Amino acid sequence: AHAVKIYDTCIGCTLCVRACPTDVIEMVPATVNAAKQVASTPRVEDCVGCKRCETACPTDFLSIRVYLQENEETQYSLGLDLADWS
Amino acid sequence: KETSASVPFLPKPKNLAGWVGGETEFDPIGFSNWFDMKWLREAELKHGRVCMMATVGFVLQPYIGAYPGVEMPADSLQAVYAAPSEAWFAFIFAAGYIESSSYNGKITQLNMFEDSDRVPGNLGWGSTRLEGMSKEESELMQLKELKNGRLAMLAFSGMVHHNIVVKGALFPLVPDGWTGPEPWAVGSIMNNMG
Amino acid sequence: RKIPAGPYSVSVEPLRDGATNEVSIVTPPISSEGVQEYLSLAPVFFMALAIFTSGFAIEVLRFFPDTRYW
Amino acid sequence: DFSKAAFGSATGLVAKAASQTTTAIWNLHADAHDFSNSSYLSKQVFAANLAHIGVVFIWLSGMHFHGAYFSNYLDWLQDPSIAPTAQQVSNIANQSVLNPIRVTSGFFNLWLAEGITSTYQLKVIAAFGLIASALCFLGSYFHMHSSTSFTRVLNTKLTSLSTHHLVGLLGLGSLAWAGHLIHISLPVNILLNAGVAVPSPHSLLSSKAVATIVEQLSFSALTSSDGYVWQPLVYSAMHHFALALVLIVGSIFLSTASNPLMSFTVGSSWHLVLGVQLFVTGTASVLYAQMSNAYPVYPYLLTDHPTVVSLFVHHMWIGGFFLVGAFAHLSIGLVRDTLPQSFSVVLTQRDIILGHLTWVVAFLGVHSFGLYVHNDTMQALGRPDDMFSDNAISLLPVFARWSTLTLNSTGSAVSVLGVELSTADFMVTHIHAFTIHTTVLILVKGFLYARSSRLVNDKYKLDFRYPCDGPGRGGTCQISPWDHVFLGLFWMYNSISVVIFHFFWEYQSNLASIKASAGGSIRALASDFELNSINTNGWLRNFLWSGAAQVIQSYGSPLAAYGLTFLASHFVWALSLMFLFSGRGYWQELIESVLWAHHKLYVVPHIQPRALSITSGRAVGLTHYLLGGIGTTWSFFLARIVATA
Amino acid sequence: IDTAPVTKMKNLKTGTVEVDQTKLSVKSWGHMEPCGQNKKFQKRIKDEAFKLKKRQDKYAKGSAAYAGVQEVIDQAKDTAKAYEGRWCGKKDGLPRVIATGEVTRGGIVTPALMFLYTTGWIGYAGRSYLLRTKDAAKEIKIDVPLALTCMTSAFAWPVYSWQDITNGRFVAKDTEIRVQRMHMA
Ligand code: CLA
Ligand code: CLA
Ligand code: CLA
Ligand SMILES: CC1=C(C#C/C(C)=C/C=C/C(C)=C/C=C/C=C(C)/C=C/C=C(C)/C=C/[C@@]23O[C@]2(C)C[C@@H](O)CC3(C)C)C(C)(C)C[C@H](O)C1
Ligand SMILES: CC1=C(C/C=C(\C)CCC[C@H](C)CCC[C@H](C)CCCC(C)C)C(=O)c2ccccc2C1=O
Ligand code: SF4
Ligand code: SF4
Ligand code: SF4
């Protein structure tokens, strides 16, 4: 499961949420940005690692970071379509 | 509307208003609008002065002989080959010093006329003669200098290319049995049946 | 312009009444300032500089073949 | 106004800070001809086509100008055996060694087939080509700036377009060419072959010339009209007349009331038409490449071996490129259409078709290259009787050695074309089939997995040309239809390279065999190709290394230019390797360090230096790879076939 | 049965390394001689002239091709006469480039100075344009009068550049430019 993290620099764009093809990122209330909302990743197990969320983050560097973990691949992380491991 | 006095079928070029030779306002291409007029005037004056000295040298070189030893060739174009190396080095040193101390190092198109009161073409060589006189007379003298400079530029170009076509000295113009210049050598797009 | 025509069109509107004796110049409405601006483009200016440099080298090689004065 | 809009792309590039990067410049170049969907898309396409026609007319005019002024066309007319040169080379630097460049484009044979005997005619053709190019440029301008929208030509007026192309363009052009042949290309070749001087071509249109000097309509004329250089022109004239007749008759005897582009948008319709047109043009180029040496049609063409080789190889390359571009534009049209429901059966049999093609490619590759490697191993082990050859296990292409049929007043092409095939031909033909199948596999996979795939399920949202979807799902690089065309171009290069290698080795083998002498009539095998083109070592030794002597020993000879282009092609091909193997990020960091070095000296360029994008890097690498490989083959073939023939 | 040509070393056990001052010049080196009397170089020139004459003989007298090859022959003769002053080995005959630093025929100091001046001119012209056109618009759209002003004004690059270097207007302070400190230095 590719770990995905959210940092203080997030400004509540919701672009990372809209860019996720597997509904990993999620908008929680917070008191750190003017938008009063901050991205969170409660469904990292569905993260394929495509880094579309990083392509849509407007901050100077990625307020959302996807750390690929090749030693912990999952059928959800590998995007398996014809093989089931459950 | 306004048209140039010299070229009646072209617009009157700006930036030639207050200048010595600007009353004829001849600038068809219009480098006035593109470049600083101070630099253009300085370049014109320097070219004219260089070419006037060059014209009198070219004319008088086959006369006033040369340095004891070198043979000033009748055709002045070969004088560069006949010139001693020490003479060339002295000439280069003198030209460099004269042209580099004249502007205190601001000898470039971006920095020459950037200080303030750098009058175009006023290197201080006898400028006191113009310090007197009466405006119109001083401008008349400057116009005489400009017209002689242009004339000598064209004349020196003509002298060089006359020595090229004749392959000889300047003064024995059109030698006996001339029948026109020899056709130009070396190939071209029209030489290989273009 | 109800009839769909491309941008920068020298075409009169095709929705006209009986035959019109009108002047419709089919030549590009170019501008001298615009032409000078276009020839000052980085591709145009630098390709012209490269062509000038290459031709200068060509002429130097023609009139001074090889490095005879090394 | 228009001049202001000429640099409008650059003005838009500098208007926004986001487009003040070198990547913006590369995008401006990459998106140059990518005419976006708009009300004037068809105008833009048609005007671009007409402008390209003008460019080709400029090229034809230049070629005729070189024939008129910088060619020994008259000397070639007096003696066809001499080397056709049509490019003078001025004495600059030290290039004087290659001053006469033997042109292998076949223009001399073409002009002789056109009845051209004087360089004045070539001058006139060059002038009229310039005039035609000017007219095409005027028309392209007009259509882009003042004409009809042209949006109805592919859907509404497709019947009119197709009927006009069938009757007017094709049929009337063939009929006019038949008239030209019969009237000035046959008589001029008659009077040149007989050596009885050639009058003005218009004097042949007098109704008092050979048109009415004798009314006999068979092979019988003044003295003895037994010229066999002339008969191919007679056959060409008959073919053009028959083709014009059948086209005109069948056009009015055809339905043509079926436009499959009703369900496609105008942009996707244009892309699909371009794809099918590219497929047709590419297969036509390949067919012409085969038929050029299969059937003699130009005077003194087969005698000029470099011309034959160049025509074959060039048209094979063009056919391969256009066949790849066909699938490229099919993919573009499919992925850029809103509702491309027409390809429902193939997008629902996606995996079935792709997997069966995958098995076909795997089977063909293992079998063909295993025959080759098995022959290599057996020859290395000293087991020539265990190889796949005529003196061993024989893979005789039986399906090739039969064309017998009921005569019904026919001849010539009722057989295998009088050529016997052997094991080497079988194996190399299967190699060709496998390489073609692999190229088609990549292209068809790009087409099918263009809108969606099992890996990425929204690839239609990503358009046609994208670098990847990310390092997720294990890695999704090169999933785009553009990347599939990118790989299919490499495999087309491989396929066409093997095809032209087969043709060139067979051609040289036949030339050596017909150089038996006259008495030598047991060629046994000999046939260097047939005896050695069964091993990879056989190729590497007797074709590449053997024929490279001409191109590497060309220094100090007129083929030194071929040698230098050989070296430059190798250089460009290794530079391609540089671009293909590497990645964008590293170069970006290197550019960051270099840009720090610049900033340290107050240089600071504002068009921020960005390294080539992923797709841009792949495209540059592919361009250099194709250029290097094709140039190496070009230099090698031309040096080998000019020095030795 | 033999090995590669065995070379002979200096069994320099004297404890000193002697460098001959008189051997610090091209004219004093025993492996390169002037091209004028180099037999191999003369043979190369003769072979080149013979090949040019053979190429000329293909074309008939008075033709344009004959004149072209004749001009090539004249160029080769003049080039040979010029190269007679070069230095070309003793077994190759190919003129050599002396990169020691001695000002000799075929040396490197004068070409190095000419190239360095020309390219410092180029770089200073570009840098001056970028400094006086701090704008991406003027980068994509060349200001031709200003560009040519900078190009013709960069002739004084060697002295202006050093003045700026010594006066602090050439280099930029490391704390004022984008320097890589992502490791949180
Ligand atoms: C009838 C022929 C034809 C036409 C009209 C088009 C038209 C188009 N193609 Mg296309 N294509 C074709 C054939 C054709 N193609 C073939 C045969 C192939 C397979 C090789 C492709 C592969 C292809 C791809 C992969 C893509 C296109 C794209 C496009 C679109 C934009 C093109 C663009 O901006 O390029 C601008 C022009 C250039 C980039 C030209 C640059 C020069 C090229 C890259 C190399 C040339 C090297 C040269 C031959 C050697 C130099 C000489 C040497 C001596 C130095 C446009 C609709 C693009 C698109 O998005 O479509 C919507 C796209 O991604 N095409
Ligand atoms: C793939 C291509 C290929 C082919 C066709 C062959 C063929 C052959 N090799 Mg060979 N070889 C190859 C590649 C290939 N080689 C490569 C790449 C190498 C290098 C490692 C070698 C190295 C090699 C050696 C060292 C030797 C051979 C030998 C042989 C021969 C005997 C092999 C054998 O026992 O067959 C075994 C065959 C089978 C077990 C049957 C497999 C094929 C069946 C028929 C497929 C049927 C599919 C079926 C139709 C599916 C539909 C069913 C459905 C309808 C129900 C034979 C002519 C030997 C020899 O000298 O003989 C001349 C030998 O000593 N080979
Ligand atoms: C104003 C122009 C300019 C200037 C002053 C410099 C200056 C420098 N560059 Mg540089 N560079 C430039 C343009 C320029 N570059 C361009 C356009 C590119 C893209 C090709 C590069 C790519 C580049 C790389 C990859 C590297 C440098 C390096 C360097 C440094 C060492 C010198 C060197 O190796 O040059 C060599 C220059 C090149 C290899 C590319 C030159 C390309 C052209 C000739 C330069 C453009 C000149 C400009 C257009 C003039 C227009 C004037 C007009 C507008 C008035 C030096 C600080 C090196 C470095 O960091 O070392 C510390 C290094 O590794 N540069
Ligand atoms: C400024 C100053 C001073 C000064 C000064 C100086 C040096 C002033 C000098 C003025 C000078 C030296 C002015 C030359 C003009 C030459 C001309 C016009 C050439 C005409 C040549 C012409 C018109 C054409 C000639 C032809 O050749 C052509 C073209 C073709 C030939 O076939 C035919 C002929 C030959 C006919 C002081 C007083 C010393 C100190 C003071 O403090 C500062
Ligand atoms: C080198 C390289 C770059 C760097 C390439 C850049 C920055 C392009 C700029 C190169 C300049 C424009 C070269 C200009 C042309 C050369 C000077 C050579 C042509 C002219 C000579 C023949 C005289 C990438 O951006 C890249 C991206 C993705 C995969 C691989 C690579 C890659 O390999
Ligand atoms: S795009 Fe980036 S800044 Fe915006 S909400 Fe998502 S993580 Fe935060
Ligand atoms: S990498 Fe892709 S799947 Fe994973 S969180 Fe980011 S957008 Fe979602
Ligand atoms: S390596 Fe490049 S192309 Fe492949 S997934 Fe990563 S970014 Fe995309």
Three-state SS letters, chain C: CCCCCCCCCCCCCCCCCCCCCCCCCCCCCCCHHHHHHHHCEHHHHHHHHHHHHHHHHHHHHHHCCCCCCC
Cα distance between residue D488 and residue D281, in whole Å: 18
Beta bridge partners of A26: A40
Query: Is there contact between B and E if contact means ≥3 C-beta pairs under 8 Å?
Result: yes
Pocket test for ligand 5, best of D579, D591, D593 (most atoms within 8 A of CB): D579
User: Minimal Cα–Cα distance from D88 to chain E, Å?
Assistant: 10
By CB atoms closer than 10 A (0-12, 13-18, 19+), residue D219 is: exposed
* Breakpoints of chain D, after residues (C–N > 2.5 Å): none
Q: Search chain C and give the residue with CA nearest E139.
A: C42
Residues of chain D contacting residue E150, judged by C-beta atoms under 8 Å apart: none
> D575 C-alpha to center of ligand 3: Å?
21
Q: Search chain E and give the residue with CA nearest B32.
A: E145
Cα distance between residue B182 and residue B16, in whole Å: 43
Asked if C40 and E106 come within 8 Å (Cβ–Cβ), the reply is: no
Asked if D90 and B192 come within 8 Å (Cβ–Cβ), the reply is: yes
Name every residue in D having a CB less than 8 A away from some CB of A.
Answer: 454-455, 457-458, 469-474, 476
Residues of chain D contacting residue E67, judged by C-beta atoms under 8 Å apart: none
Resolved by: cryo-EM
Asked if C40 and E141 come within 8 Å (Cβ–Cβ), the reply is: yes
Give the alpha-carbon dihedral of E20, E26, E30, E33, to 10 degrees.
-170
Residues of chain D contacting residue E170, judged by C-beta atoms under 8 Å apart: 601-602
Query: Is there contact between D and B if contact means ≥3 C-beta pairs under 8 Å?
Result: yes
Instruction: Read off the DSSP letter of residue E22.
Output: G
Interface C-D: count of C-beta contacts within 8 A: 66
Structure tokens at D392: 């061993």
A15 and D CB contact within 8 Å: no
In one letter, which amino acid is B161? H
3 state SS of D17: helix
Which are the contacts of E184, defined by CB distance < 8 A and separation ≥ 6?
none
Q: Search chain E and give the residue with CA nearest C45.
A: E142
Measured over all CA atoms, what is the biggest interatomic distance in chain A, rounded to whole angstroms? 45
Asked if E136 and D596 come within 8 Å (Cβ–Cβ), the reply is: no
Structure tokens at D574: 């290794």
> D585 C-alpha to center of ligand 8: Å?
10
User: Minimal Cα–Cα distance from D453 to chain A, Å?
Assistant: 10
E181 and D CB contact within 8 Å: no
Which of these, D446, D436, D534, lies nearest to D494 by C-alpha position?
D436
Task: Report CA torsion sign: E125, E131, E133, E134.
Answer: positive
> B17 C-alpha to center of ligand 8: Å?
65
For residues D306 and D104, is the Cβ–Cβ distance under 8 A?
yes
Instruction: Read off the DSSP letter of residue D205.
Output: S
Orientation angle between helical segments D614-643 and D22-30, nearest 10 degrees:
60
Structure tokens at D82: 């001499």
Cα distance between residue E132 and residue D638, in whole Å: 52
Chains near D (3 or more Cβ pairs under 8 Å): A, B, C, E
Residues of chain E contacting residue C57, judged by C-beta atoms under 8 Å apart: none
Residues of chain C contacting residue D92, judged by C-beta atoms under 8 Å apart: 58, 61-62
| Pocket lining for ligand 2, CB < 6 angstroms | D 366-367, 370-371, 373-374, 377, 386, 393
CA distances from D66 to A7, C45, D19, D105, D394 (A): 69, 30, 44, 12, 51
Pocket test for ligand 3, best of D598, D599, D603 (most atoms within 8 A of CB): D598
Ligand 8, atom 2: closest residue by C-alpha: D477
How far from each other are the two terminal CA atoms of chain C, in whole angstroms? 69
CA distances from B128 to B124, B131, B145, D642 (A): 8, 5, 16, 80
In one letter, which amino acid is D242? A
Query: Is there contact between A and B if contact means ≥3 C-beta pairs under 8 Å?
Result: no
Asked if C8 and D10 come within 8 Å (Cβ–Cβ), the reply is: no
Which of these, D424, D376, D360, D417, lies nearest to D397 by C-alpha position?
D424
Cα distance between residue D436 and residue D216, in whole Å: 50
**Chain Cα centroid distance, residue A82:** 25
Asked if E180 and D603 come within 8 Å (Cβ–Cβ), the reply is: no
Residues of chain A contacting residue D470, judged by C-beta atoms under 8 Å apart: 48-52
3 state SS of E95: coil
Which are the contacts of D424, defined by CB distance < 8 A and separation ≥ 6?
D389, D529, D530, D531, D533, D534
Q: Search chain C and give the residue with CA nearest D144.
A: C6
Asked if D146 and C62 come within 8 Å (Cβ–Cβ), the reply is: no
Query: Is there contact between A and C if contact means ≥3 C-beta pairs under 8 Å?
Result: no
In one letter, which amino acid is B163? N
Asked if A52 and D457 come within 8 Å (Cβ–Cβ), the reply is: no
| Pocket lining for ligand 1, CB < 6 angstroms | D 30-34, 274, 278, 321-322, 324-325, 328, 332, 464-465, 482, 485, 489, 623, 627
Regarding beta strands D85-88 and D100-102, do their DSSP bridges make them parallel or antiparallel, or are they unpaired? antiparallel
By CB atoms closer than 10 A (0-12, 13-18, 19+), residue D483 is: buried
Ligand 7, atom 8: closest residue by C-alpha: A20
In one letter, which amino acid is D640? R
3-state secondary structure D53-106: HHHHHHHHHHHHHHHHHCCCHHHHHHCCCCCCEEEECCCCCCHHHHCEEECCCC
D99 and E CB contact within 8 Å: yes
Asked if C65 and E79 come within 8 Å (Cβ–Cβ), the reply is: yes
Q: Compute how many other C-beta atoms are within 10 angstroms of the C-beta atom of residue D241.
A: 17
By CB atoms closer than 10 A (0-12, 13-18, 19+), residue B46 is: middle
Q: What length is written for chain A?
A: 86
Q: Which atom number of ligand 6 is nearest to the Cα of residue A6?
A: 7
By CB atoms closer than 10 A (0-12, 13-18, 19+), residue D475 is: middle
E strand segments, chain B: none
Instruction: Read off the DSSP letter of residue E30.
Output: T
Cα distance between residue B10 and residue B29, in whole Å: 10
Q: What length is written for chain E?
A: 185
By CB atoms closer than 10 A (0-12, 13-18, 19+), residue D175 is: middle
Which of these, D181, D175, D180, D183, lies nearest to D212 by C-alpha position?
D183
D16 and C CB contact within 8 Å: no
Which are the contacts of E102, defined by CB distance < 8 A and separation ≥ 6?
E25, E26, E109
Residues of chain E contacting residue D604, judged by C-beta atoms under 8 Å apart: 130, 134
Cα distance between residue D164 and residue D409, in whole Å: 35
Asked if D92 and C31 come within 8 Å (Cβ–Cβ), the reply is: no
Q: Search chain A and give the residue with CA nearest D476.
A: A50
Cα distance between residue B61 and residue B70, in whole Å: 12
Give the alpha-carbon dihedral of D83, D89, D95, D101, to 10 degrees.
-20
In one letter, which amino acid is B41? R
- Reported resolution in A? 2.9
Q: Search chain C and give the residue with CA nearest E151.
A: C49
For residues D133 and D62, is the Cβ–Cβ distance under 8 A?
no
C37 and E CB contact within 8 Å: yes
